[PDB]
């Protein structure tokens, strides 16, 4: 996770 795009 890191927001709600790529990172999660």
Same mark, same amino acid.
């Given at each position: 996770? @890191? @927001? @709600?795009? @790529?990172?999660?």
């Amino acid at each position: 996770h @890191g @927001g @709600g795009w @790529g990172q999660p």
